[PDB]
Amino acid sequence: MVYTADQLTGYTAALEAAFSGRSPKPHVAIGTDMRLPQYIQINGDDRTVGIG
Amino acid sequence: HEFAELFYRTYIVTPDQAGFQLSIRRNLVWEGWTGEGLSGEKQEISKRNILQGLLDYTTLETNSTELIPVIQSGENDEQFIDPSVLPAQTVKQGKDTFDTNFLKFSENGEGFNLLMLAQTPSRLKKGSMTFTDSLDSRIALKQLLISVTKGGTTELFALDVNRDQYAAYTATREYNFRLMQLKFHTSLGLGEESTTVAGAESALLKDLFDLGYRIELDVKVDGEMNVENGNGDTSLRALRLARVFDKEGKEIALTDSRVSAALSGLTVTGVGYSLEARLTNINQLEMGLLIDSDVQKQGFMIPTLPPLVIVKPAMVEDDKTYPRLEALTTAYRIQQMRNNAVTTLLNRADTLKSYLGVGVPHPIESNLGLEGVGQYYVRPYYNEATIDVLNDLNNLTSAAKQTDIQGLIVSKINEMVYTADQLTGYTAALEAAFSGRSPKPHVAIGTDMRLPQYIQINGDDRTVGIGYDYTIARISDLRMKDKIVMTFILPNESEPHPLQHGVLGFIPEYLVDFNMIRNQRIGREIRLTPRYRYFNFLPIMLVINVINLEEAIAQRTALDVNETQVTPAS
Amino acid sequence: AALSGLTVTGVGYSLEARLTNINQLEMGLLIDSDVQKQGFMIPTLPPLVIV
């Protein structure tokens, strides 16, 4: 879901054009209840929401 | 931008030159001019590039010395077998075409003159055959024709008597300085796999060959030959059925039920033979294969593009009807580098698909209206395939499904690269162009922004292929979507070669500022003239498509199974 | 069989001809810039009271 963005959406290039002089690392927002965070963080899949 | 730089090397031309020319040397091999036919039907024989010779073997291995029999009815009908048992065979050597056949087994004299037999049309045009033409030191038998007859039906077996125990004439001494004998004494085996003339299985041996039985014949061939005059003769002394051996190879008596039943009425008799003789050309009356060089020179011309210009009123100081200069440079950079660069590549793919066909290589020198001089070194080749990740995936744990698609696509890319290298013979051309360098065909990888997180490895073996160097390039343009382009490039070399994929003609351009009066206005026009053009040489390109990539992740995919039928079904 | 009675003839052609307008009588790509702004207001909200 995160990767399918930025391409047909073009967020990162727009960020670079808007803000010049830094490396663009988009920040991913995570929102959920008390229940899912038990199943979001582990060790065993390097990607949590996406590498980098 | 890195993409167009990767696929098309930038070439800088000083502004006083309007183009560049390329003159490529070629080395050709061709069987010689025709003399007086129509001097080659007013179109000289097609010459074959020697670099094509590393792959196929037909452009070589001449036959211009072998003294194969030639049929000339009315003079040499007797020496050749009765044509009612075998039609005349057509063979080709040099510019001559004629028909050959098996000789007869001479009986009670009537020896044959082998030199006088093989008068090909090129010989007669040269004139009558001289005295000094001497045979070679190796005289051998090619084929021996056996006649397996049983009940009235005749089946022929062409046995290659060449390459057996005693098949070459051996010099013998009485007092004669040039006489060689032959005493052919051995056993010929006819296995089950043995095939009749023009293929097919013999019906006369079907019963035995169902049981895996084999038979042997004793072949008693005697003969003598000279190599300074050309006379010769040959007789057949004996040929009889010897034994029968089973499917394992023990001796079976001829009186056993199956053997005796199957071999009743069987008869075998020799028919003829053919000779391996060459003429040691001591007078050097041969023309062989010649070698020459030619060049095709092509000129490339660079145009001047329509101007890119802004207009602002004079006397007025502006930041929003016109920004800083940087906008002009940025707009020109966009126009040259991104919109135009992904256009030539797609047109190349479409042209290759349209004209060369999918997966079908064309011979070297077999195209003239195609792009670039690169076609004069390498086999033209373009191939494309599709990956259906949803229906082409095998994973067990849902926690490792992504390594699965990574490995699948990497393996497919590997195979595409290897098969392209195999068919087009790029490595030979690379070794031919340079000698200090060693063949390291780089893989130019073109892809959009989606796949590079799935090609780059995480814990998986292989990225692009063992011994292949690579450079993955991404472009955000939406013309490219779920598409990959791959071709070979030169990593380091910066001048146009036939092995370069494409060279970008680029000329420095300078702006001009001068206020115009066009229809009663005074306003400062800043004018930037572009001049550039992409050029393309190599006829090699590979494309792989990715489809349903999101789908396969969306659903579980597990274990397409072949429930291989232990139930009453087959 | 397929090529019997097949005739091919030329009809026309077209030119990629450009004019090197040294005096530059063209419009090209005109570059401008505009500014757009927005209106945002912060309202009052119902209070909370104790007796």
Cα of first residue to Cα of last residue in chain C, in angstroms, is: 107
Question: Which DSSP letter does residue B104 get?
Answer: P
d(CA B133, CA B57): 30
The SS3 of residue B208 is: helix
Query: Out of C20, C29, C35, whose CB is closest to B331?
Result: C29
In Å, how far is A23's CA from the nearest CA of chain B?
17
> Do A10 and B476 make contact, defined as CB atoms within 8 angstroms?
yes
Question: CA-CA distance, B409 to C50, in Å (whole number)?
Answer: 68
Set of chain A residues whose Cβ sits within 8 Å of the Cβ of B476: 7, 10, 13
Q: What's chain B's Rg over C-alpha atoms?
A: 37
Beta bridge partners of B214: B245
What are B217's strand-pairing partners?
B188, B241
Q: Which residues contact B446 (CB under 8 A, 6 or more apart)?
A: B3, B6, B7, B345, B473, B475, B480, B484, B485, B486
By DSSP bridging, strand B140-150 and strand B290-301 are: unpaired
The one-letter amino acid at B47: K
N- to C-terminal Cα distance for chain A? Answer: 15
Q: Decide if B144 contacts B159 (C-beta within 8 A).
A: yes
The DSSP secondary-structure symbol of B337 reads: I
Contacts of C32 in chain B (CB under 8 A): 320-322
Best of C23, C31, C33 to substitute, by most chain B Cβ atoms within 10 angstroms, is C31
Structure tokens at B402: 């992504």
Does the CB of A1 have a partner CB in chain B at under 8 Å? no
Question: Structure tokens of B83?
Answer: 């044509």
In chain A, residues with a C-beta closer than 8 Å to the C-beta of B453 are 3, 51
Contact B393, B404 (CB under 8 A): yes
Cα distance between residue B413 and residue B543, in whole Å = 10
d(C-alpha B443, C-alpha B452), whole Å:
15
Experimental method: cryo-EM
Classified as helix, coil or strand, B214 is strand
Cα(B312)–Cα(B524) distance, rounded to whole angstroms? 6
**CA–CA min distance B409, chain A (Å):** 18
Which 10-39 residues of chain C touch chain B by CB within 8 A? 18, 20-21, 24-35
| Touch test B–C: 3 Cβ pairs or more under 8 Å | yes
- For every residue of B277-322, which 3-state class applies, written as one string? CEEECCCCCCCCCEEEEEEEEEEEECCCCCCEEEEEECCCCCCCCC
Considering only CA atoms, which of B132, B117, B126 is closest in space to residue B79? B117
> B119 has which bridge partners?
none
Alpha-carbon gap, residue B361 to B421, rounded angstroms: 12
User: Is some CB atom of chain B closer than 8 A to the CB atom of A2?
Assistant: no
Find the residue in B nearest to A52 (Cα).
B453
A/C Cβ contact: 3+ pairs below 8 Å: no
Q: Please answer whether residues B356 and B381 qualify as being in contact, where contact means their C-beta atoms are separated by less than 8 angstroms.
A: yes
Cβ within 8 Å of residue B53, ≥6 positions away: B29, B59, B60
> Which residue has 């206020």 as its token pair?
B515
Distances (CA, A) of C41 to C35, C36, C44, C45: 20, 17, 10, 13
Chain A residues whose CB is inside 8 A of the B458 CB are 46
Question: In this structure, what DSSP letter does residue B87 have?
Answer: P
**Chain B residues with CB-CB distance to C33 below 8 A:** 319-323
Count of CB pairs separated by less than 8 Å, A with B? 16
Side-chain half-sphere CA neighbours of B555 within 13 A: 9
| Residues of B whose CB is below 8 A from C24 | 307, 309, 512, 525, 527
**Regarding beta strands B89-93 and B381-388, do their DSSP bridges make them parallel or antiparallel, or are they unpaired?**
unpaired
Q: B496 near B3, Cβ under 8 Å?
A: no
Give the tokens for residue B421.
């290298």
The pair of structure tokens assigned to B539 is 């006829």
Resolution reading in Å: 4.1
CA B360 to chain centre: 11
3-state secondary structure B378-427: CCCEEEEEEEECCCCCCCCCHHHHHHHHHHHHHHHHHHHHHHHHHHHCHH
Burial zone of B208 (CB within 10 Å; 0-12 exposed, 13-18 middle, 19+ buried): buried
Helices B426-433 and B401-424: crossing angle, nearest 10°?
60
Bridge partner list, B75:
none
Residue B348 to residues A11, B326, B388, B537, B543: CA-CA distances in angstroms? 31, 33, 25, 10, 12
Q: Could you tell me which of B356, B352, B344, B552 has the C-alpha nearest to residue B446? A: B344
Chains B, C: CB contacts within 8 A come to: 46
| Sheet bearing B290-301, strands edge to edge | B48-49, B19-30, B290-301
